[PDB]
Structure formats: C-alpha cells, structure tokens
Design a protein around this ligand. Structure first.
Ligand code: OGA
Ligand code: MG
Ligand code: NI
Ligand code: ZN
Length: 331
C-alpha cells in the first residue's frame, strides 16, 4: 500500500503533466496521496492563474462574517455574525488595521502558537462563500471555473441525468479567520487555490480515521452531538492540535502559500486558519472513486446545515432512503 502512514504529499507537476486534470488526480491517488486526506500541488513555473490582481478591489463581499468564538482555547465553537457589505478594497484595509493585522512573529510555528493561544479572544471578519472566479478565461490548465461538473461525473459513471450546476467560490481572509472541522458536502473532493496574500494553515485527519475524530467531537461538544447526528456539518467546531494529540487522533498539518493548490479527498476532515489578508478560490469535484463515499455520506437532518440546490439531486439519487427526512431538514 502506498503512503501507509497517511502523510500529506506534495506534488510538482511539469507543464506537460498539468494538462490533464483528471489524469493527475488519478496519479496522485496511485501514489497514496488520498490516504492523508489532503495534498499540495505546486503548479509548473510557467503557469499563471491570471496576469495581475491589480483590479480586484471592486469585488463586493455582500455579507462579511464576524467569527465569534465560545469555549476554551483548544475546544471552541464559532458563530457567524453577519456584517454590512464591503468591497474587497475596504476589507483589505480592515485586515491591515492595527485591530486586525497579523502580529509580530518569528516564523509559521510561533504564529501557530499565537493562533491557538489567542484565537478565542478576538473576532476576525471572513469574506466567505462568494460565488465567482479569479481565473483568467484564457488559463486552460487547472482553471477552477472550467472543471468537469459533478453532475456530468454522475452521468458518466451511473447513467443518470440530473439538474444542478457546480461553480467556484471566493474566500477573502484575514489574520485568525477560521475554517472549522468538516468534510465536504456529500464527502466530495475539494480543490483550493490561494490566489494572493498571506498563507493558510491546514489540519487534516486521514479518511481511514475520520470516525475517531467524530467520536472525539461527540465527547467534546456533547449537547451539539445530541441535537444532531452529523453536527460537524454545521461547520462550527474547532479542536486544537494539542487536544487532538492528547486524545490520540491521527492528523497532519501543512501551510499553503500564495500560488499553491490544495486538494481535499473524500471524507478527509480538515480545519485551519489564515495568517493575514488573502484570497482563495475553491470548488468541489468528483471522480469515480467518490461515488461510494457519496452513497455513505452522513447528513445533517436537524436543519442547521441547510445546503445547496445541487446537493438535493445528489441525495435523491445516491441516498434515496434518506431523501424524504433530509429534505424535511432542508424545507
Ligand atoms: O479556505 C477556506 O476557508 C475553507 N476551504 C475549504 O474548506 C476547502 O477548500 O475545502
Ligand atoms: Mg474589482
Ligand atoms: Ni473544505
Ligand atoms: Zn444538524
């Protein structure tokens, strides 16, 4: 078995190898990359997502989210308070303010320490889940707005034709902005490109060990656990590396820098934080190996996680028994 310790792998494709996305994902899996739950892909030196970022300040963040934490430093939840709309220009200025900017630090490790020590005492503002793309339409390789769609993958593999579309989303982050422990909707893959700015640190649990994370989370958030049989779908719970180590949960960490792609694999729990002002683009995708994960994916039926028009059809076809009670939570 390749990569038996489930280490995060880093790949450096040539421009020639960067021409066939599906084939490269299959290559990475042949090398055991999926066992980690997360892989880094450094694009060929000749590749660019776009010519410049010089005119992005006019993008609107219609509902910036203030991430308010409750709990203790290593075990907390966050809630998103909606704020008034602001432009990317306005948001960047806020990120750079004395109140919100990245603190002095020695290196990524000192900054990680400061994050876990201090996150709960601040409420950073996140411009998340903004439909759009920053790839130039002439970028032909690894353009997240030109990928084959999940609906077309299900059609090719299973023969069924369903409604729905699949488009990317932009994320504008600042120091301490946080993504809680989650897998993707329907345990899909995701791909994330860090277009610009300061890094993003990721933590990931190997898919083969995901249930160990779930069991810990039920112990650490016991009322959440009673309210919903899949509450990590709410994307509110954080657990520090220290806590994971104290409880024997296998995990890995890696820092993504501007210009790099990350891939999350089916049922790879992941969480992380941003080091400073940045802009990422991400989208979910499928391969044939995903289909069995989609059939087995947990769902939130308490009604909190409340998910997309396109996810309806996935549940309908892959989880017909659930269909019924799941759409009761979504209607
Ligand atoms: O970048 C973020 O805030 C969160 N992204 C993801 O969880 C992803 O790409 O799967
Ligand atoms: Mg603009
Ligand atoms: Ni994700
Ligand atoms: Zn729920």
């Amino acid at each position: 078995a390749q990569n038996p310790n489930c280490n995060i792998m880093i790949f450096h494709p040539t421009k020639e190898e960067f021409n066939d996305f599906d084939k490269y994902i299959a290559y990475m899996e042949s090398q055991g990359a999926h066992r980690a739950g997360l892989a880094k892909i450094i694009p060929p030196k000749e590749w660019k997502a776009r010519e410049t970022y010089d005119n992005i300040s006019e993008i609107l963040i219609a509902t910036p989210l203030q991430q308010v934490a409750s709990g203790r430093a290593g075990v907390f939840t966050q809630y998103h308070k909606k704020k008034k709309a602001m432009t990317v220009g306005e948001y960047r200025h806020l990120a750079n303010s004395k109140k919100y900017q990245t603190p002095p630090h020695q290196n990524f490790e000192d900054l990680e320490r400061k994050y876990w020590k201090n996150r709960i005492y601040n409420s950073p503002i996140y411009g998340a889940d903004i439909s759009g793309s920053l790839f130039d339409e002439n970028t032909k390789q690894w353009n997240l707005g030109h990928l084959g769609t999940i609906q077309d993958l299900l059609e090719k593999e299973c023969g069924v034709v369903i409604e729905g579309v699949n488009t990317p989303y932009l994320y504008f982050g600042m120091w301490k902005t946080t993504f809680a422990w989650h897998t993707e909707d329907m345990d899909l893959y995701s791909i994330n490109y860090l277009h610009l700015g300061e890094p993003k640190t990721w933590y990931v649990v190997p898919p083969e060990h995901g249930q160990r994370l779930e069991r810990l989370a039920r112990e650490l958030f016991p009322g959440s656990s009673r309210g919903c049989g899949a509450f990590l779908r709410h994307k509110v719970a954080l657990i520090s590396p220290t806590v994971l180590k104290e409880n024997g949960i296998p995990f890995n960490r890696i820092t993504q820098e501007a210009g790099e792609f990350m891939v999350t694999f089916p049922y790879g729990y992941h969480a992380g934080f941003n080091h400073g002002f940045n802009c990422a683009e991400a989208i979910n995708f499928a391969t044939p190996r995903w289909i069995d994960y989609g059939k087995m994916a947990s769902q939130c039926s308490c009604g909190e996680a409340r998910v997309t028009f396109s996810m309806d059809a996935f549940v309908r076809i892959l989880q017909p028994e659930r269909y019924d009670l799941w759409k009761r939570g979504q209607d």
